[model samples]
Target: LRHTFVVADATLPDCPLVYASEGFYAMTGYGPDEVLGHNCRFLQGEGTDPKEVQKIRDAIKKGEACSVRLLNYRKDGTPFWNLLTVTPIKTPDGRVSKFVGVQVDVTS
Candidate 1:
């Protein structure tokens, strides 16, 4: 969330192999349309916990919400602490529509 708390399809920008948003850019030092459609794993480096990501993925796979805090990385390949909140959206018929993640970037 920025000045406006919203989302612009995290996949939309990644699909084109580019990045988006000033906050995301300033935080990671990439311009819009740079990380689109690409692996956001780029933000993860040595200090990032693969287990945390796996936990989130596993919970999302089971259509559950996950709130976890773990070490992560930035675009500049810097390690940082992150509070990740992942929510799985379901259709009216109880089918998973999408997995949405809202991150609280607390890297200092």
Candidate 2:
């Protein structure tokens, strides 16, 4: 799959990942044991642009939707261009409960 998905707990400190799809595991070469309960920042590395990362952080802090193309690394340390989209998941009480992140490999 070209795209993968992950859900992060908004109420948790650092918004650690609570769930990840099979596609995410395959795309990143990381298994559930290594991915769950950790921040997605693990995929980021020296090649990742700080400016793009900041945009995502800003949107997350504001509970807004964000889309950015940035460099990310796989578990094997291979670099790829990831087109990432993040959206705040709101509960019935209108509170941001979680964040759904969709990642697409655009490293052509």
Candidate 3:
């Protein structure tokens, strides 16, 4: 879904909208409250490729940012192509505390 991704740690707050524009809410049937504090992985449906998920995880573990286009799913259990970019932010001491993801939906 175009709406939300879960906050990976306690540092990230549960926010409605969470920097997402109005178009995000419009695409998914979620208001600010409905989409906060949940891991975005839930967006992946039965058809979602595990390899794609692992790719993101791998980059995060290494404190690297990755940009890739993949096919994902929505909350309604529909399949769609997602263009995702994940940028993991690290501390000076090399600790990854947060990540930012931007998703663009290309499936019509």
Top model number, lDDT: 2
TM-score, cand. 3: 0.71
For every candidate in turn, the CA RMSD to the true structure comes to 4.3, 1.2, 4.5
Clash counts for all predictions:
14, 0, 3
TM-score, every prediction: 0.68, 0.94, 0.71
Best by TM-score: 2
lDDT of 2: 0.92
lDDT of the candidates, in the order given = 0.58, 0.92, 0.63
Residue-level lDDT tens digits of model 2 in 1-108: 568999999999799999998999998999999999999899999999999999999999999989999898999999899999999999999889999999999887
Q: Which regions in candidate 2 have their CA more than 4 angstroms from the true location?
A: none
Rank order by TM-score, top first? Answer: 2, 3, 1
Better of 1 and 2 by TM-score: 2
Residue 20, candidate 3: C-alpha displacement in angstroms: 3.7
Pairs in steric clash, model 2: none
The TM-score measured for candidate 1 stands at: 0.68
lDDT of 3 by residue, 1-108 (tens): 453332344245421123445655555545656665565665677777888888987887666888777776555656778778877767788776777777778676
